[PDB]
Amino acid sequence: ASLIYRQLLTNSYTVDLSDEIQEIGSTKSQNVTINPGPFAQTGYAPVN
Amino acid sequence: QNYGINLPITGSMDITSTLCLYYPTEAATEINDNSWKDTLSQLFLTKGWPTGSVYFKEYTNIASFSVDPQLYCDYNVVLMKYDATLQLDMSELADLILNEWLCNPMDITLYYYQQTDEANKWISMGSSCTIKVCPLNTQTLGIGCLTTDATTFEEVATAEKLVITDVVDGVNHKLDVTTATCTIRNCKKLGPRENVAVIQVGGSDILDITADPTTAPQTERMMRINWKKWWQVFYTVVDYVDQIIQVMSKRSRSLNSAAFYYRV
Amino acid sequence: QNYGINLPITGSMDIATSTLCLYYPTEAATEINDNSWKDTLSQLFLTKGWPTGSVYFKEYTNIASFSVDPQLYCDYNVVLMKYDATLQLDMSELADLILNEWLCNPMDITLYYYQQTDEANKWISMGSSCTIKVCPLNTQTLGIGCLTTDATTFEEVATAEKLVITDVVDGVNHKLDVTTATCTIRNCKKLGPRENVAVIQVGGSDILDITADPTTAPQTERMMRINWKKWWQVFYTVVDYVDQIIQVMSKRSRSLNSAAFYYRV
Amino acid sequence: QNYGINLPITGSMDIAYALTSTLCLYYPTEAATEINDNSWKDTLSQLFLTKGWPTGSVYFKEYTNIASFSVDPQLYCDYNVVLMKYDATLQLDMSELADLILNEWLCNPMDITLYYYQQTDEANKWISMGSSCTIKVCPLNTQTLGIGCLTTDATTFEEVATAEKLVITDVVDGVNHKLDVTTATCTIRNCKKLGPRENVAVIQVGGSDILDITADPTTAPQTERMMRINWKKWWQVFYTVVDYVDQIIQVMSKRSRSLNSAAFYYRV
Amino acid sequence: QNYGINLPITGSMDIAYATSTLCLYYPTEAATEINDNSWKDTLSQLFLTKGWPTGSVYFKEYTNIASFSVDPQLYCDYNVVLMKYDATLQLDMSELADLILNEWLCNPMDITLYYYQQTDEANKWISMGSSCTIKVCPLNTQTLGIGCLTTDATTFEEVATAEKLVITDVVDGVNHKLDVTTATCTIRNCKKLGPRENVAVIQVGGSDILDITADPTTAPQTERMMRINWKKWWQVFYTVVDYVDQIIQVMSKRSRSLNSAAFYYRV
Ligand SMILES: [Ca+2]
Ligand SMILES: [Ca+2]
Ligand SMILES: [Ca+2]
Ligand SMILES: [Ca+2]
Ligand SMILES: [Ca+2]
Ligand SMILES: [Ca+2]
């Protein structure tokens, strides 16, 4: 009856195939890099 | 789980943590990058600390930080910027955060206070601590001062954010602290606090964490590094985090088996 | 170290400096209307056998105000709590907080969903005005009877409270909406009893549920109650029977930091 | 005769076993200017002869500043003693110079325009020397993408040096970096600290003992060759050095690398 | 202390037993002909196949043999120098090859004050600089010149003129006065210790012309001196990359010195 544990561990490479099957159906999206930092304070010029 | 008792431990000879990093605002100003905390977090991850286990605390000055410096973390590393005019302030901050203090209240307007032994001190913290003391002889009369008049009192602090006062033991004193902007507590030094380490930047190893004038011990948790770039300071800390942690240790008061021994 | 906690102690069934903090409301001082009453009480405690300089007197304006991060200062703490019919829950929460040992971790409601692991897990929130609204989430992280995006549909469990001990259904994730500006909420676990503190309730009936379980309403030895008409008489009672109160209490539970809870990040 | 191998050396614990070298003394131009004597080198040579050093064996080398001396401090001499003047604002410069001249460094080239670089060990540093070094590093994640910086744009790089004559950069080990050194004036090498250099000793003439020659923040060793004195007269300083040359030499030792038994062990 | 160099090693005749850096010195001609911006990256990738991890192969460019001979530097564990044959520079090639391939121990040579003599066949005078002009006047036992007045340098016998690198060998056991142009030249008294397996020389073109011994009766062709016929620098570089195994096998990195200098300086 331990064969169940042994085989569950052995035949685990198919988990990757299942993951690929899920991934292909997953909706994909991309993110762009965020401009970081203490942005310089620039204000209006002196006008009249 | 026999808490509260001290039982001898016999041994045989033949046989998930959080890290807090305290830094002055000057460091962030020089870094001048808003992603620097995340960058250091990823570097710590390379060193093995999982993301989110490293917290970055910012304080404006040693003066501000000295006002009740609560350090909640499994390990704490404080980057202290050396200033030649703040030697006593740095020493007091290091003494307060590198040792475990058991503090009781002080009601200066109702009792006279004396220090029972060498381990007892008066710790005052607040916006402006100005402590004046009048020692009393066995007849409850001032020695060199007049209890009724506080001008004659001897001033031992002035507008101090944090001050550790050590008067002669065995003699009662009348205190005249500024309770409005200061709280003074009668504290006793239980022992070291392995939770905290101090890294001084600059200077020449000027720290006396012992009130005894005959000793200026330099514990392993007191370190000093020469610096010119805060990025290099932080890179050094990240790269040698293993050594810093090894120098430090888990907080004994925090650990279970501290129950009924002044836990936490 | 371990202090040998993992070792047994064998005993035979035939063998044969501390400090006292008294918390009182401003009402008591106002009624007494004496400036030297603290000195008088210190001298009476001296007659009882408490060295001068060992008894301290802490004052709070109200139970609600005192509930905001209470501080336990002395080796023995005795809190005189005045009974108000409209404040039964507030008295119970304050008594629970200052009579039980709590271990609290930070909560970042704005970035996470939280749940209570076990019956010992409560959410303790303190501040100027705590207003906790909750939205339970099903297994698919969707609100039950509430729209996660819209907080107006959340369910209100506290309103402008100085102290709240929220108890939600265990094992269920909740999105929380609180006024973090005027309130901090922590995920706390009740470790056990704190024999360092005792509460003497002056006024009404025996009303203090220090257990969230509705089937349990324990009345420990540290939960005393008296009937009062003069605060001088109340203080004389406390001073005269301090020995019994101390015998009921135990100073070993004193913590290092005087906060009502052990904080872990 | 059996060079390049490590044969165990066996010796006895109960047996009794009952000049030719060259000394170089490095000092700043301030010393000569204060002494204000043309024949002071000859006078010191005669006093060294009295102490036992044949004339012509004591060389006197002059450097204008610590900053200038840090640029390739070549010390080829059986014994070297460097009198460096303490300055409160140059603690890191003094420490870097002391580390460079007191430890042995095996350095490899660095072409930062072809390769990313990572430090593999606590003994591996990036030592850069020249007229003006401005090191700006960008750590890269496993995708060769900058962390907190943009690989394409240098202005986002994190700066760890600015117009440094000498600098010893230490970044987090095991992570690739993209560097933007100003190679037009300064050269950077990937160096490994083999160990102490017994040839050289440094005497700090001035303030307190601040040198630390270990990158590790938990240790600031104060070895034998790191000496410190107070001063008000350079003549007094030189008299002290001459009088206690024997103690200084005893504290120092001949360079292990240049011993003819180090052949095939990174020298001779 | 001494690594036990004085002790013996006993090995048996029967018992079965069964990040290095590579520098490539090349002339600017090679880069100009290659005429590619990323050819160093290409060669790095190709070396990666032969097994040198990225970051281990460095490429050094020198304008000429003459310039490269001015205090050459050996940077890597294995230094391979590509030398372009020029029929008019055979002695310069020989001198550079001798200097790099052989270990030298040099002492300072203050010529304005002291007479110097070569001691044994292993001692030479190595001068390097922008322009090294050397005129030697041998002296008899009386300290008088032989065929040259000591005071007047115009009578001195010239040995090198405006040379970047000179390895001067004079008659051993006879003092000389040298009027070496020290303004642009530095001359040192050197002794040849032995081979330097760290460095190998590959000569492109030519007809196997390299004497690395002062002795005229011997022109040894060690295993680290190689020659290839060439018409494309890409072909030369591909040859070097494809056969890096053989070149490294012929070399040995234990001769790696602490400093990059081609000689050991002793004051
Ligand atoms: Ca006075
Ligand atoms: Ca202070
Ligand atoms: Ca004292
Ligand atoms: Ca409440
Ligand atoms: Ca609803
Ligand atoms: Ca619950």
Ligand SMILES: [Ca+2]
């Ligand atoms: Ca420097």
Ligand SMILES: [Ca+2]
């Ligand atoms: Ca940046």
Ligand SMILES: [Ca+2]
């Ligand atoms: Ca490093």
Ligand SMILES: [Ca+2]
């Ligand atoms: Ca002639």
Ligand SMILES: [Ca+2]
């Ligand atoms: Ca030549």
Ligand SMILES: [Ca+2]
């Ligand atoms: Ca000769």
